[PDB]
Amino acid sequence: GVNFRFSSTTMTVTEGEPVSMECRYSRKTDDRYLLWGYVPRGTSAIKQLLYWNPGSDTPTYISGKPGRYRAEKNFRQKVMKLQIAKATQQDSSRYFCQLTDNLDFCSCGTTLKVQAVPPSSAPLVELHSPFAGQLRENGTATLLCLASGFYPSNVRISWQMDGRTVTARVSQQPMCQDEREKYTAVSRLQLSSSTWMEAHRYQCTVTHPTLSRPIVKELRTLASLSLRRPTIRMIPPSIREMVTHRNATLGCVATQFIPDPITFSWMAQGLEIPGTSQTLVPTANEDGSYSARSLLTVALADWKSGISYTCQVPNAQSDPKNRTLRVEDAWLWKQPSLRMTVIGTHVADGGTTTLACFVSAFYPGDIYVSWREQDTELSHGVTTFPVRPDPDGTFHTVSQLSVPSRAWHSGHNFTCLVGHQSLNGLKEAQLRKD
């Protein structure tokens, strides 16, 4: 007569769920009473719950309420089962499979622990993405939908784009659980460069029984400025350089939205000019875009001949319209007319006489006006007004020079020089006193 308990074992069940205890025996003769018993809470004696008579597979319940227990003996498979239908906390006891020959008791037992049902909680949903702004760079993306801290594990995470349910490229890692029996699910939606850089409305919808309405997170992305074609602007040569240095410098300003170094190439009449292709580092701007500038110097004769100079940067517009600098048709040029006058008439004094040079009837409007006292260039007192357009289609301007009366009444020569595109040199107009 011995009641063993394997105290290094236990059976755990959630409150309300059924328990299925089972014992295997090695007897080859069905000649003994088989019993299922349990030790009630607060005592130390094994109260009998049910038994089978030797040779009979019919359970003989003696205690409890016939409905809470379900027994089953099968001498073929050598099994004796006892099931508790709806586990309660009071069921947490020691349970024994017993064998005896008359009501010499040999029993083998274990313990039963009854855990509570975890409190149902609602999932916290978080939708995350890489930088989803306008300045978003080119590349593939991975949208993330995290749902944490919920019970039970019957959560559904779905993806939508522009109202349409998306199924491809949706990967959800295996379900997860912490020490507090709260679950965590992670869904990911992988997006190609094309779709990611377009304006779209992504949505993650999470459905859970603790929620009457699904939790919907939204990400509304505008079209990416990284797919905008680089803008090229041309800077024509300055007349100042054309008359002074007699070089001609053309400029090419390329504005991208990618900070990558920009490589510029120059073509003359379609053919690339050797030794002129050059790469420069762009410069960040106000809107976030980057801008670089390339310069190309040519001879004055080549520029005035009518050569078409084209600027090309990789991935630009095919129309060479806003990318080409060429001198205008020669029959459209108008030579500037110069008209000088003097205003601001013992004299002596610190009086100032002002000389005016009217430059009119020229095309295009780029003009260079300078003043010279004999054979010396003047910088002080010179005021060249901006060029204004004519109803005749040409342009006109005025240039003033304030000189002390000491130099005008002495008898110096005052020259107004005008350099223009339609001139092979500089057109002079002299003005002396007497």
Ligand X SMILES: *[C@@H]1O[C@H](CO)[C@@H](O[C@@H]2O[C@H](CO)[C@@H](O)[C@H](O)[C@H]2NC(C)=O)[C@H](O)[C@H]1NC(C)=O
Ligand Y SMILES: *[C@@H]1O[C@H](CO[C@@H]2O[C@@H](C)[C@@H](O)[C@@H](O)[C@@H]2O)[C@@H](O[C@@H]2O[C@H](CO)[C@@H](O[C@@H]3O[C@H](CO)[C@@H](O)[C@H](O)[C@@H]3O)[C@H](O)[C@H]2NC(C)=O)[C@H](O)[C@H]1NC(C)=O
Whole-angstrom Cα distance, residue 134 to residue 285? 15
Task: Give which of ligand X, ligand Y, its own copies, none residue 341 binds (C-beta under 5 to 8 Å, depending on kind).
Answer: its own copies
Residue nearest to ligand NAG according to CB distances in the complex: 319
93 or 224, CB closer to ligand X? Answer: 224
Least distance CB 248 / ligand Y (angstroms): 8
Task: Give which of ligand Y, ligand NAG, ligand X, none residue 111 binds (C-beta under 5 to 8 Å, depending on kind).
Answer: none
Whole-angstrom Cα distance, residue 267 to residue 163? 49
180 binds ligand Y (CB under 6 A): no
Least distance CB 411 / ligand NAG (angstroms): 5
Whole-angstrom Cα distance, residue 239 to residue 420? 7
Q: Which of 418, 377, 378 minimizes the C-alpha distance to 397?
A: 418
Q: Which of 151, 143, 193, 197 minimizes the C-alpha distance to 172?
A: 143
319 binds ligand NAG (CB under 6 A): yes
Interface with ligand Y: number of residues (CB under 6 A): 5
- Whether omega before 364 lies within 30 degrees of 0, making that bond cis, reads yes
322 binds ligand NAG (CB under 6 A): yes
Amino acid in position 343: I
- Whether omega before 386 lies within 30 degrees of 0, making that bond cis, reads no
- Coil, helix or strand at residue 244: helix
Binders in 249-278 for ligand Y, by CB under 6 A:
none
Q: Binding marks (x or -) toward its own copies, 122..161, rule CB under 8 A?
A: ----x-xx-xxx-x--------x-x-xx------------
Amino acid in position 390: D
Query: Which stretches does DSSP call E strand in 300-381?
Result: 309-312, 324-325, 337-343, 352-362, 367-373
Whole-angstrom Cα distance, residue 352 to residue 146? 82
Binders in 348-407 for ligand NAG, by CB under 6 A:
374
Q: Binding marks (x or -) toward its own copies, 54..93, rule CB under 8 A?
A: -------------------------x--------------
Q: Is 209 exposed, middle or buried (0-12, 13-18, 19+ CB in 10 A)?
A: exposed
Helix (H) or strand (E) holding 96: strand 94-100
Q: Binding marks (x or -) toward ligand NAG, 7..46, rule CB under 6 A?
A: ----------------------------------------
Of the ranges 133-141, 208-216, 265-273, 394-402, which one interacts with ligand NAG (CB under 6 A)?
133-141
260 or 272, CB closer to ligand Y? Answer: 272
CB count in 10 Å sphere of residue 233: 14
Pairing between strand 2-14 and 106-115?
A: parallel
- Coil, helix or strand at residue 242: helix
138 binds ligand X (CB under 6 A): yes
For the chain, the residue count is: 434
Least distance CB 266 / ligand X (angstroms): 24
Whole-angstrom Cα distance, residue 161 to residue 164? 5
What letter does residue 133 receive in the DSSP assignment?
S
CB count in 10 Å sphere of residue 33: 18
Task: Give which of ligand Y, ligand X, its own copies, none residue 287 binds (C-beta under 5 to 8 Å, depending on kind).
Answer: its own copies
Q: Binding marks (x or -) toward ligand NAG, 289..308, rule CB under 6 A?
A: --------x-----------
138 binds ligand NAG (CB under 6 A): yes
Binders in 228-267 for ligand NAG, by CB under 6 A:
245-247
Task: Give which of ligand X, ligand Y, its own copies, none residue 106 binds (C-beta under 5 to 8 Å, depending on kind).
Answer: its own copies
Whole-angstrom Cα distance, residue 76 to residue 172? 46
Binders in 285-314 for ligand Y, by CB under 6 A:
297, 299
**How many CA atoms, within 13 angstroms, populate the side-chain half-sphere of residue 64?**
23
283 binds its own copies (CB under 8 A): no
Rule CB under 8 A: choose which of 86, 113, 180, 245 binds its own copies. 180
156 or 432, CB closer to ligand NAG? Answer: 432
The sign of the CA dihedral 403, 409, 410, 411 is: positive
Chain residues that interact with ligand NAG, rule: CB under 6 A:
138-140, 193, 245-247, 297, 317, 319, 321-322, 374, 411-413, 430, 432
Chain residues that interact with ligand X, rule: CB under 6 A:
138, 193, 227
Chain residues that interact with ligand Y, rule: CB under 6 A:
245-247, 297, 299
